[PDB]
């Protein structure tokens, strides 16, 4: 199961500590941040729900839009950092956190605001062997999602190999596929990249319409609407 | 006549072989640096769209930390840095992302560029990212130079909160700044180092006062626990489309 590696004491910390990031990770994070900001404005989302938020990697986006924020992560320590930041930034009335599995939240959690955008950041979707389970759950509590994945360029694969080595992923193996590159590790680590075509196809199969699609050397970022989601203001 | 007079100007530390690399390597960043970088990225993106800037000039761009902003707006981009290795990385990325027609780089002192450089596009926004302004003991000459080739600037600085000062101390130690000293001041804490390293933070009030003294009007101001980011217009810059 996808949650196995991130239930390990230092699974999340090793993956999300900036100290383990090659410089070339930054353009993926920057594209995703800008797309999330623009999507929330255009689709009139009053709430941002960040799945796998760690220490609140998208909190600043909600802050600049005066939107509600919910961060969901399994990492208790990273959530305490986020809780402290929310308090010190005077955002207690607008921002909250939950320590839970993201699938528990998407299937069972209460609504955040009236029009919530769900962010799947920094290749979160790529950590799922069966991603349809997560994508199918989004429609219930959201009018929109932003999905950020690693691409399948030679440079993307090289950056990822360097990244996952620095994180100290054990039994790290590279598996070249048609529609992306899969990395596996011995402690249940799983991460795949996506071709633009494979990502679009997967999203269509789960009833998610692509409104915006951005690509750089390292990443694909898409803004999607559920089929049957209200498109109003 | 004098052995070291004129040798500790802002450019001195960044003319050292590994000066730029040590400061701009993402691995040396505490996690709490990321909200500063995210806020300035969002403000730069929004400013360019609203003010109809067709060009982004990133001063101290390193490997092209704001290239993605220009790319997502289909804007022209110029990256200015003293670091040849980081500019080479940026040139490769520009080629591979098919931006050779609209993105360029210069290896030069940012002050040489702002004083003597040709215009970029028709309406350029100048980005002073990641506390660049704070590396100057006397920043007024840089701010005074901005009006000539720009209709707008985004200025990103560390704030003077207890947390900001602690994050900066951790950050500068991870960069391996030698003889690191912390100088507490009301309007922004100053860190110094052995090889000419100088970095100050700014209070909201001090940053606003400095910008006004240099004829730069704040039109948007954002703050978090760690940082202040402002969008400024020069007094007399055209504000058309
Ligand atoms: C951005 S993907 C990595 C981050 O997402 C978090 N994460 C990954 N999978 C889950 C999950 N199933 N439930 C909650 N948080 C998760 C990890 O703890 C880490 O902070
Ligand atoms: C964001 S401040 C650090 C970055 O700005 C660059 N930088 C600092 N001062 C100058 C300067 N005077 N001219 C050019 N690049 C500079 C450094 O080389 C580094 O990439």
Numbering used by the authors:
A (entry chain B): 13 to 245
B (entry chain A): 5 to 245
What does the paper say about this structure?
AZE synthases catalyse the intramolecular 4-exo-tet cyclisation of S-adenosylmethionine (SAM), yielding a highly strained heterocycle. More recently, AZE synthases have been discovered in bacteria, namely AzeJ and VioH, which are involved in the biosynthesis of azetidomonamides and vioprolides, respectively. Interestingly, they show sequence similarity to the class I methyltransferases (MT1). Each subunit adopts a classic Rossmann fold, consisting of a 7-stranded β-sheet (β3↑, β2↑, β1↑, β4↑, β5↑, β10↓, β9↑) surrounded by helices α4-6, α8-9 and α11, a topology that is typical for MT1 enzymes.
Interestingly, the Fo-Fc electron density maps reveal that MTA and AZE are bound to the active site, suggesting that the substrate has been converted via an intramolecular nucleophilic nitrogen attack on the Cγ-carbon. Intriguingly, the structural superposition of AzeJ:SAH with AzeJ:MTA:AZE only shows marginal changes of the four-membered AZE-ring in the active site (rmsd = 0.3 Å, 221 Cα-atoms), except that the nitrogen and Cγ-atoms are moved by 1.5 Å towards each other. The amine group of AZE forms hydrogen bonds with the hydroxyl group of Tyr175 and the carbonyl oxygen of Phe134. Strong cation-π interactions with Phe134 indicate a protonated state of the nitrogen atom in the AZE product. Based on the atomic insights, we propose that during cyclisation the positive charge of the sulfonium group migrates to the C-N bond and accumulates on the AZE amine. This charge distribution is stabilised by cation-π interactions with Phe134, thereby facilitating the subsequent cleavage of the Cγ-S bond, which ultimately forms the neutral molecule MTA. Moreover, the AzeJ:MTA:AZE structure provides insights into how the α-amine of SAM, protonated under physiological conditions (SAM-NH3+), can be deprotonated. Similarly as seen in AzeJ:SAH, the carboxylate of AZE forms three hydrogen bonds with Asn139, Y176 and S203. The latter two residues further coordinate with Arg172, which is additionally H-bonded to Thr193 and a water molecule.
